[PDB]
Amino acid sequence: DFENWTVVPVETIEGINYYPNCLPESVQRNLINNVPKELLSIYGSGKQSHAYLPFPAHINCLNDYIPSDFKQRLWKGQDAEAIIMQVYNPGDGIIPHKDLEMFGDGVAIFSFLSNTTMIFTHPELKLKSKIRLEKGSLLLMSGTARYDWFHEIPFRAGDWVMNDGEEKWVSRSQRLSVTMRRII
Ligand SMILES: O=C(O)CCC(=O)C(=O)O
Numbered sequence: 001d002f003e004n005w006t007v008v009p010v011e012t013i014e015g016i017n018y019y020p021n022c023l024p025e026s027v028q029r030n031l032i033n034n035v036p037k038e039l040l041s042i043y044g045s046g047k048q049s050h051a052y053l054p055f056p057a058h059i060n061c062l063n064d065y066i067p068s069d070f071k072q073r074l075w076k077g078q079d080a081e082a083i084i085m086q087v088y089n090p091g092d093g094i095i096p097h098k099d100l101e102m103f104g105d106g107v108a109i110f111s112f113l114s115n116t117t118m119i120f121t122h123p124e125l126k127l128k129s130k131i132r133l134e135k136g137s138l139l140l141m142s143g144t145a146r147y148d149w150f151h152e153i154p155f156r157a158g159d160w161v162m163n164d165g166e167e168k169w170v171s172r173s174q175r176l177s178v179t180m181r182r183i184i
């Protein structure tokens with residue numbers, strides 16, 4: 001598949017900003033301790049959970065780790081209004097998509113528990129790009145990244161990851177994302 005396509009660096013995609021080790025461990029633990037225990041079930045397919053403001057502190061504090069320059073530029077200096085928490089047990093993913101127009105520009109994703117791989121697709125350009133979303137990271141998607149490209153998480157139970165010159169198949173563990181957006 002995709003023999004007509006090129007894989008380019010994620011840096012070539014305007015409006016993708018990635019911040020490894022954005023959340024202190026203390027913040028990650030406080031959030032995870034405070035999610036309903038049913039949400040983190042290891043069995044079958046990961047569950048999801050919509051939350052609407054006012055958010056409790058263990059969520060709401062995530063607003064503080066979204067860079068101010070992003071919120072000013074796109075969110076009117078304000079904080080997130082809609083939040084979705086999604087669990088991914090090994091083998092879970094999401095098909096390529098662009099986020100719904102009801103949200104307008106600037107999407108923040110916080111990652112918890114374990115690492116995964118997200119793939120960006122531009123069918124008109126015939127390009128792919130990939131980013132490793134690590135535990136504790138923040139991904140901001142806006143502009144070209146958010147309107148021009150699709151994103152997905154492949155449905156599989158590991159990812160090939162290149163590190164220190166070697167490539168290994170890193171098994172997936174349970175992963176939780178928190179996606180923070182505004183309604184336009
Ligand atoms: O959970 C993720 O990392 C991606 C979620 C997503 O793409 C979405 O909420 O539209």
Ligand SMILES: [Fe+3]
Binds near residue numbers: 098099151
């Ligand atoms: Fe999305």
